[PDB]
């Protein structure tokens, strides 16, 4: 085959272009014959002249163009040339890579570029990656609008997720403003994530206006399609920093590597067309005379030629003549004037590269560990992540929601994990255990859960006010009216052996041991592994009464596979207490928390949350 | 089953099944609606 490639500017003859192709794909039955010419300077008259002149010396069946230039027009000129020669031309860099008008169907042209819909898609993927759900679009009358809106409308609409489009703004750069009408619109929008679409210069004006409006400042973020960043060589600092935009790469594929890809595409296309018809692609190149006969056959090649692959990598083009999911790099404006790569994206898929840690434990009311959907890979809905050293577990429930609301009101951020050692806080011999340890070790600032309150822990750590009425209580099948009757005090007084037990290492058990020794020493035999298992001892028989926290026992009273279980008396509990929350000591956010708590009931949210999480179906009947 | 909102539904059980057809419009009610979105999975 006969092929030609050209490089413009850089002021250089460079070895690397041979190095580029490094006699690449020599293996292919058909060999490329290459003639290289470079031009220090380009002109539509110069560029037009040189390639045809080269047609006269080389009679090449394909051309690759490359430039140092920022110039938009060159690509389009080359499209015209494709129309003229009916000889394929493509380009690996610069202006030829820069986007152009929709290509004539008859014409054969390729660019290392993309489109508008694809870019919008990448913007959406980027937003999805950072999970920025809520966004607005500021656009201008510049071409592609409301097709941008349309593409977004489909892309945003199809997905199940409830992301929000806040505003779409269309402002004409023409009829330039004394009114600062752009300021007047732009100032209005409250959204955190902004997609902008316009000419580069217009972007300058819109950004000056945004800087006046205050839209550029922290927490709001801007995202841009390819056009505004352009070359990226020159960046008026009128653009805000942290500006996020998409662009073509230039490192993942050296100028020589890209040329090698182009040569490979031309010769691969030649090879596929050969394999199909066993026919030489070579054709008379001369523009001046009429197009050579049998050039019309080349048409079929293009239809066939659209997807070309080398190195197990797709150069596959699209109907516009841009490569399919061309190396498309996610780029950001690094501090100062730097443009630094962040993510890479290709084809369908994209890949991009006051603390107060809280510890909890899994219980019944307001506290449930669930295993997240593996396909999803991350937690869903109300579930908030919690880690357990032994793996990510997903915690959700009443307490989780309360924590979320308190945090929302006081406006701070937090890390949540699960306790390993000793569950609920326990004093054994000299030393404490459980979440309280991590509160003491300062491995947890505040501990949240079904944790009960007692004098010792209030002594060591400040506690939040009780949100719920709870305490020690009994759960039994259908006994103690006095409930202090001492029938509990001694089993032995009653000739048949009686039975009652509770979970060990509990505030209940410690309290019991403190006040009533005999009960503890007797009940150690009736102690049970877990609340589900304690329930197993009650439910299947072999145990008469069960004793546990009143909130849990009441919720379990309400929730049972059959209404076989009920509370004791009115469920009016001795040791009247409520669930608190740990803090370190006298120094803490402290009171600020407390206020938040009573705002929660203050708006009546707790009743709703009670109906949803705490309310059981049972005990309606009685 | 006391109501459309049945505590028995609200108190689901592996032991007590409640059955439907996937892709039945009811399923669309379950997926589209956020308020009961938790209840859909059971």
Swiss-Prot record, chain A:
The job of this chain, per UniProt, is described as: Component of N-methyl-D-aspartate (NMDA) receptors (NMDARs) that function as heterotetrameric, ligand-gated cation channels with high calcium permeability and voltage-dependent block by Mg(2+). Channel activation requires binding of the neurotransmitter L-glutamate to the GluN2 subunit, glycine binding to the GluN1 subunit, plus membrane depolarization to eliminate channel inhibition by Mg(2+). NMDARs mediate simultaneously the potasium efflux and the influx of calcium and sodium.
Q: Where are glycans found on this sequence?
A: 307, 505
The entry's family comment says:
Belongs to the glutamate-gated ion channel (TC 1.A.10.1) family. NR2B/GRIN2B subfamily.
How is this protein organized at the quaternary level? Heterotetramer. Forms heterotetrameric channels composed of two GluN1/zeta subunits (GRIN1), and two identical GluN2/epsilon subunits (GRIN2A, GRIN2B, GRIN2C or GRIN2D) or GluN3 subunits (GRIN3A or GRIN3B) (in vitro). In vivo, the subunit composition may depend on the expression levels of the different subunits.
Its domain comment says: A hydrophobic region that gives rise to the prediction of a transmembrane span does not cross the membrane, but is part of a discontinuously helical region that dips into the membrane and is probably part of the pore and of the selectivity filter.
Q: Which residues bind Zn(2+)?
A: 93, 250
Q: Which cysteines are joined by disulfide bonds?
A: 52-287, 379-394, 386-395, 563-618
Query: Would you tell me the protein name for this molecule?
Result: Glutamate receptor ionotropic, NMDA 2B
Provide the tissue specificity: Detected in oocytes.
Which residues are L-glutamate-binding? 452, 457, 507-508, 549
Q: Which residues lie on this side of the membrane: Extracellular?
A: 1-478, 479-622
Curated annotation (Swiss-Prot), chain B:
Q: Which domain of life is it from?
A: Eukaryota
> Which positions are annotated as binding glycine?
25
Q: State the compartments where it is located.
A: Cell membrane; Postsynaptic cell membrane; Postsynaptic density membrane; Synaptic cell membrane
Subunit text? Heterotetramer; the NMDAR subunits are modular and harbor tiered domains that function in concert to regulate opening and closing of the cation-selective ion channel pore. Forms heterotetrameric channels composed of two GluN1/zeta subunits (GRIN1), and two identical GluN2/epsilon subunits (GRIN2A, GRIN2B, GRIN2C or GRIN2D) or GluN3 subunits (GRIN3A or GRIN3B) (in vitro). Does not form functional channels by itself.
What is the documented function of this protein?
Answer: Component of N-methyl-D-aspartate (NMDA) receptors (NMDARs) that function as heterotetrameric, ligand-gated cation channels with high calcium permeability and voltage-dependent block by Mg(2+). NMDARs participate in synaptic plasticity. Channel activation requires binding of the neurotransmitter L-glutamate to the GluN2 subunit, glycine binding to the GluN1 subunit, plus membrane depolarization to eliminate channel inhibition by Mg(2+). NMDARs mediate simultaneously the potasium efflux and the influx of calcium and sodium.
Q: What free text does the record give on domains?
A: A hydrophobic region that gives rise to the prediction of a transmembrane span does not cross the membrane, but is part of a discontinuously helical region that dips into the membrane and is probably part of the pore and of the selectivity filter.
**What family does this chain come from, according to its entry?**
Belongs to the glutamate-gated ion channel (TC 1.A.10.1) family. NR1/GRIN1 subfamily.
**What name does this protein carry?**
Glutamate receptor ionotropic, NMDA 1
């Amino acid at each position: 085959m006969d092929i030609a490639v050209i490089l413009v500017g850089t002021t250089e003859e460079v070895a690397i272009k041979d190095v580029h192709e490094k006699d690449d794909f020599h293996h292919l039955p058909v060999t490329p014959r290459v003639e290289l010419v470079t031009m220090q300077e380009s002109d539509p008259k110069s560029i037009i002249t040189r390639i045809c002149d080269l047609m006269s010396d080389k009679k090449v069946q394909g051309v690759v163009f490359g430039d140092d230039t920022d110039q938009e027009a060159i690509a389009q000129i080359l499209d015209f040339i494709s129309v003229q020669t009916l000889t394929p031309i493509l380009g690996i860099h610069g202006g030829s890579s820069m986007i152009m008008a929709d290509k004539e169907e008859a014409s054969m042209f390729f660019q290392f570029g993309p489109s508008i819909e694809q870019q919008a898609s990448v913007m959406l993927n980027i937003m999805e990656e950072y999970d920025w759900y809520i966004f607005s679009i500021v656009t201008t009358y510049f071409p592609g609008y409301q097709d941008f809106e349309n593409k977004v409308r489909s892309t945003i609409e199809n997905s199940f997720v409830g992301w929000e489009l806040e505003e779409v703004i269309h402002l004409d750069m023409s009829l330039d403003d004394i009114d600062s009408k752009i300021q007047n619109q732009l100032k209005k929008l409250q959204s955190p994530v902004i997609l902008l679409y316009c000419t580069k210069e217009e972007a300058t004006y819109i950004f000056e206006v945004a800087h006046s409006v205050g839209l550029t400042g922290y927490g709001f973020t801007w995202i841009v399609p390819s056009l505004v960043a352009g070359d990226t060589d020159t960046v008026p600092d009128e653009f805000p920093t942290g500006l996020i935009s998409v662009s073509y790469d230039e490192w993942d594929y050296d100028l020589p590597a890209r040329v090698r890809d182009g040569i490979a595409i031309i010769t691969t296309a030649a090879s596929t067309m050969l394999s199909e018809h066993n026919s030489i692609p070579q054709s008379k190149s001369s523009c001046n005379n009429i197009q050579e006969s049998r050039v019309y056959e080349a048409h079929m090649l293009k239809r066939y030629l659209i997807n070309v692959t080398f190195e197990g990598r797709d150069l596959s083009f699209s109907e516009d003549g841009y490569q399919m999911h061309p190396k498309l790099v996610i780029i950001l404006l690094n501090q100062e004037r730097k443009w630094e790569r962040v993510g890479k994206y290709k084809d369908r898929s994209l890949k991009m590269w006051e603390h107060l840690s809280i510890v909890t434990l899994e219980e019944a009311p307001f506290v449930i560990v669930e295993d997240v959907d593996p396909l999803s890979g991350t937690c869903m809905r109300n579930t908030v992540p919690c880690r357990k050293q032994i793996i990510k577990r997903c915690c959700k429930g009443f307490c989780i929601d309360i924590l979320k609301k308190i945090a929302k009101t006081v406006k701070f951020t937090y890390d949540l994990y699960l306790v390993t050692n000793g569950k609920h806080g326990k004093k054994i011999n000299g030393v404490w255990n459980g979440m309280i340890g991590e509160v003491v070790t300062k491995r947890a600032y505040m501990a949240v859960g079904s944790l009960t309150i007692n004098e010792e822990r209030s002594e060591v750590v400040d506690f939040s006010v009780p949100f719920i009425e709870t305490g020690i209580s009994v759960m039994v099948s259908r006994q103690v009216s006095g409930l202090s009757d001492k029938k509990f005090q001694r089993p032995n007084d009653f000739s048949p052996a009686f039975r009652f037990g509770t979970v060990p290492n509990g505030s209940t058990e410690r309290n019991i041991r403190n006040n009533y020794l005999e009960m503890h020493s007797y009940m150690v035999k009736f102690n049970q592994r877990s609340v589900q298992d304690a329930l197993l001892s009650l439910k299947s028989g072999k145990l008469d009464a069960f004793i546990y926290d009143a909130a849990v026992l009441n919720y379990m009273a309400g929730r049972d596979e059959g209404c076989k279980l009920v509370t004791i008396g009115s469920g009016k509990v001795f040791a009247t207490t409520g669930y608190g929350i740990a803090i370190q000591k006298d120094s803490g956010w402290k009171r600020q928390v407390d206020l938040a708590i009573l705002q929660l009931f203050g708006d009546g949210e707790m009743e709703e949350l009670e109906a949803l999480w705490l309310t059981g179906i049972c005990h309606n009947e009685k | 089953i006391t109501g459309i909102n049945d505590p028995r539904l609200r108190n689901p059980s592996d032991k007590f099944i409640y059955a439907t057809v996937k892709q039945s419009s009811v399923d669309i009610y379950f997926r589209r609606q956020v308020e009961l979105s938790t209840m859909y999975r059971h």
